[PDB]
T-cell receptor, first 112, second 113 residues
């Protein structure tokens, strides 16, 4: 089964700075036939459900601020917040839907 | 945008009994072209990430105990937990991946009575 490991577990950045979160998959999630990486990124705040930010590893979801971006391929992915804003404080997760059982990373806490 | 609303928001159930959680979608998530409901259920405990329980509305993910079952179609879905166990205490979510933006329900907190 595919396991996702995020780094770091907690990240603290100043207001307006760039935030980078990594996710490494034990196996590649890149479909060689369609060139798509079945990897998604989610944001979750206390008392609320997870919210999809990025899918196909680098495609931004509707409604998500443009400062959020995803990159990477195969087994190494990165979520980037170009300029951090107070409202970005939350827990971030990567999730693979390439092969069952689908699985989430352990989560990364982002604070100011 | 399709919005999912769960009911109840929280519930207390006795060990060994059946727990039922409902999810209503503002618009149908059933694709008439292939007969599939793009609806999934997740379980989440404090300090841990969400864990997929059911997808396609009724297909149980591998590794998940048979006491978890999903049913429903179109705009109404149900997650049933039979023979409740102490470790089933968590927040449960439904999630639709039919149309963008994909979306989760608000969550239902299940506790032991």
């Amino acid at each position: 089964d595919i396991v996702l490991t995020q780094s770091p577990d907690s990240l603290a950045v100043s207001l307006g700075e760039r935030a980078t979160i990594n996710c490494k998959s034990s196996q590649s999630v890149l479909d060689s036939s369609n060139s798509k990486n079945y990897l998604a990124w989610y944001q979750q705040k206390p008392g609320q459900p997870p919210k999809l930010l990025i899918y196909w590893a680098s495609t931004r979801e509707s409604g998500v601020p443009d400062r959020f971006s995803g990159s990477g391929s195969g087994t190494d992915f990165t979520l980037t917040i170009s300029s951090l804003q107070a409202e970005d404080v939350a827990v971030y997760y990567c999730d693979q839907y390439y092969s069952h059982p689908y699985s989430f990373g352990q989560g990364t806490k982002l604070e100011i | 945008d399709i919005v999912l609303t769960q009911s109840p928001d929280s519930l207390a159930v006795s060990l060994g009994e059946r727990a039922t959680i409902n999810c209503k979608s503002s618009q149908s998530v059933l694709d008439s072209s292939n007969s599939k409901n793009y609806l999934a259920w997740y379980q989440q405990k404090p300090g841990q990430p969400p864990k997929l329980l059911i997808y396609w509305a009724s297909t149980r993910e591998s590794g998940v105990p048979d006491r978890f079952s999903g049913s429903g179609s179109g705009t109404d879905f149900t997650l049933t937990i039979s023979s409740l166990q102490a470790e089933d205490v968590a927040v449960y979510y439904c999630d639709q991946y039919y149309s963008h933006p994909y979306s989760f329900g608000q969550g239902t907190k299940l506790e032991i009575k």
